[PDB]
Design a protein around this ligand. Sequence first.
Ligand SMILES: Cc1ccc(-n2nc(C(C)(C)C)cc2NC(=O)Nc2nc(CCOCc3ccncc3)cs2)cc1
Ligand SMILES: CCCCCCCCO[C@@H]1O[C@H](CO)[C@@H](O)[C@H](O)[C@H]1O
Length: 334
Amino acid sequence: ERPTFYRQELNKTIWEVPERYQNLSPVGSGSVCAAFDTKTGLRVAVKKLSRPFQSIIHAKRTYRELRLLKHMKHENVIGLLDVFTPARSLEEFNDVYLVTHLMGADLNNIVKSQKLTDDHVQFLIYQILRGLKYIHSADIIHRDLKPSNLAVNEDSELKILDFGATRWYRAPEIMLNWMHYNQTVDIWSVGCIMAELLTGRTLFPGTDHIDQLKLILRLVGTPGAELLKKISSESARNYIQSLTQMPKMNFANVFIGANPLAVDLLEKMLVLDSDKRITAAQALAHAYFAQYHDPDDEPVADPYDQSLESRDLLIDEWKSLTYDEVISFVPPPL
Ligand SMILES: Cc1ccc(-n2nc(C(C)(C)C)cc2NC(=O)Nc2nc(CCOCc3ccncc3)cs2)cc1
Ligand SMILES: CCCCCCCCO[C@@H]1O[C@H](CO)[C@@H](O)[C@H](O)[C@H]1O
């Protein structure tokens, strides 16, 4: 019942993998190998976790990443094809390998800093939003959505993932270290991605943190009264009160020649006040996605318990809990 493993040697480490996985070729530092899975006939990424139980911190991340990927089962969210260890018992458990689909590209490798047709933009943003609907219904905020976190195959089929400038896609409240993120920080990132796919150009290419916030304010305006009332920081309150009011720009004069439904969607994504931004569920119902939208095929997740990973446990306890997740893993049907 236990598969037969082979001990090869890549990127200065003894990988030990099941025989089904062949032609292991390294692709970037855990360290990840590309492989061919003879059991399914798929090209796969095998990730050897790095020093998973070296420290409490490593042990927690290992367990958090494994737990969450096991939970994630949606076409537009990365998921697990397999999880394995060479260990036969908990007492020798020291390495964790994760296996997923090999996509071949991220969104930059697809975009090449070029304009996409309006139709292609629809299909790509629809899939991001559909994947965010699922994630957000699990009560998870991504927080670092950007093109390098989006895997795309040749047919432009898209998966959201998290590899663990980047700041270009970050919501203003995150740049400013507010400590109460709503899920629409991810919608902010979607809006920045969409703009750039439509225009060929980064929407906010800040040279640095302050510049990034100057660029944002230029597009969306300085905070109104309703937003200013929501600021608890006195020093933040004061500084904003001291700014020269700037009007919000008219997006049609920024996205010249785009579909006006794309323009209208961008106006609903890139609202300074995060409470006033469109949600993922809402955005999928927007007429921009009329050709792709299907209310009966836009699934939600069972809610996910994040308190399990926020515990303060001993190394051996995280390890024994990670071991259990390895053992209970059930692959998907193919
Ligand atoms: C500590 C922690 C916990 C959770 C997460 N999250 N949260 C998320 C979502 C569920 C999106 C919120 C996803 C992840 N994690 C995640 O994506 N991990 C990855 N594993 C690989 C292995 C294969 O790489 C190459 C490859 C992949 C695909 N196509 C070609 C090449 C890639 S990305 C991150 C860190
Ligand atoms: C440069 C100053 C303007 C930036 C204002 C950020 C607007 C985000 O808006 C704010 O999102 C916060 C979540 O962190 C919530 O606490 C607030 O309810 C919401 O209004």
